Structure 1
């Protein structure tokens, strides 16, 4: 695994520098919401909407496993299938998602990536569309989740408590980012968090973060 190079207060500084409101929350203040990761839960998107998911307890990352491919600059279906099997072998059921309004283009993160909204940040675009990616993930043993409703995220939780995660609540929505999980998969963490913040910004999400720590 890789590790975080940056500290929580720096993350906060980084966010405030981007015009965000950000603070540090102690895991003890969330003893109730913080759930231990269940290896049977899908590693899914930070999306705060409800969905047909029945495999809870998995870590949250932008676009599900797309976050891993995005961070590493993996842009092929085969590479995506590699990542799908890698995730499955590291204690999590891999997945990507779409919704009922825009089908596979229902994942804000991937749409941003596919449409080049990450060009300015120097990210290689994927070499496949949302439909190809989803089917490729499925064929490699991954899950295709489907959301519904509208985005009503009120806050962004950047959880740094390893082995723990936060779940969606469609009636009181929030974006959830398990930063500790980027470390587990050897991603450039700073680079991952910045990508997550930019994702929320470009989707017009709430620029308010709560950084959860042990």
Structure 2
């Protein structure tokens, strides 16, 4: 794994510097919501909408496992399958998702990645489309989740409490980003967080974040 080379205060700084409203929240005040990660839960997208998921308690990352492929510059189906098997071996059920309105293009993160919206940040675009990616994840043993309804996120949670997560609430929506999970998968954490912040921004999400720490 890789370590957390950026402090919560710096994260807050960075965000406010991109025009965000941000602050640090102590895990003890969210005691009732922070859930110990359940290994049978799918590692899924930050998306705040309801879905047909029945595998709760997994880590939250942009586009599900796509965040990992994205951060590492992995752009092929074979590489994506390797990541799917890697995730499953490291304690989480790998997933990606789509929705009813746009099918497999229903994951805003992937659509941004596929459409070159990360070009400016120097990211190699995927070399496959949303349909091919979803099917490759499934074929490699992962899950394809399906959301519904519209995006109504009121805030962004950047959870830095390792081994814990927050769950979606379709009636009082929020984006959830498990930053510690990036360390677990040895990702460039700073890059992972900037990418997550950018995703909210480009999707016109709320630029209000709460950084959760022990």
TM range (shorter): over 0.9
| Partner in structure 2 of residue 72 of structure 1 | 72
| Partner in structure 1 of residue 103 of structure 2 | 103
- C-alpha distance in structure 1 between counterparts of 2:97 and 2:149, whole Å: 14
Q: CA RMSD in A?
A: 0.2
- C-alpha distance in structure 1 between counterparts of 2:210 and 2:83, whole Å: 29
- C-alpha distance in structure 2 between counterparts of 1:73 and 1:111, whole Å: 16
| Shift of residue 116, structure 1, vs aligned partner | 0.1
Q: Which SS does the other structure have where 2:141 is aligned?
A: coil
TM-score, length-scaled by structure 1: 1.00
- C-alpha distance in structure 2 between counterparts of 1:40 and 1:52, whole Å: 15
Per-residue CA deviation, residues 22-60 of structure 1 (Å, 9 max, x unaligned), is 000000000000000000000000000000000000000
| Shift of residue 100, structure 1, vs aligned partner | 0.3
Q: Which SS does the other structure have where 2:195 is aligned?
A: helix
Per-residue CA deviation, residues 49-95 of structure 1 (Å, 9 max, x unaligned), is 00000000000000000000000000000000000000000000000
- C-alpha distance in structure 2 between counterparts of 1:201 and 1:132, whole Å: 26
Stretches of structure 1 lacking an aligned partner (at least 5 in a row): none
TM-score, length-scaled by structure 2: 1.00
Asked whether 1:120 is paired with 2:93, we answer no
| Shift of residue 10, structure 1, vs aligned partner | 0.1
How many residues are paired up?
214
Per-residue CA deviation, residues 149-170 of structure 1 (Å, 9 max, x unaligned), is 0000000000000000000000
- C-alpha distance in structure 1 between counterparts of 2:190 and 2:16, whole Å: 15
Q: Which SS does the other structure have where 1:28 is aligned?
A: helix
Stretches of structure 2 lacking an aligned partner (at least 5 in a row): none
Per-residue CA deviation, residues 120-159 of structure 1 (Å, 9 max, x unaligned), is 0000000000000000000000000000000000000000
| Shift of residue 204, structure 1, vs aligned partner | 0.1
- C-alpha distance in structure 2 between counterparts of 1:19 and 1:181, whole Å: 25
- C-alpha distance in structure 2 between counterparts of 1:124 and 1:3, whole Å: 24
Give runs of ≥4 in structure 1 deviating > 4 Å. none
| Shift of residue 206, structure 1, vs aligned partner | 0.1
- C-alpha distance in structure 2 between counterparts of 1:111 and 1:191, whole Å: 19
| Partner in structure 2 of residue 167 of structure 1 | 167
| Shift of residue 4, structure 1, vs aligned partner | 1.1
- C-alpha distance in structure 1 between counterparts of 2:157 and 2:3, whole Å: 19
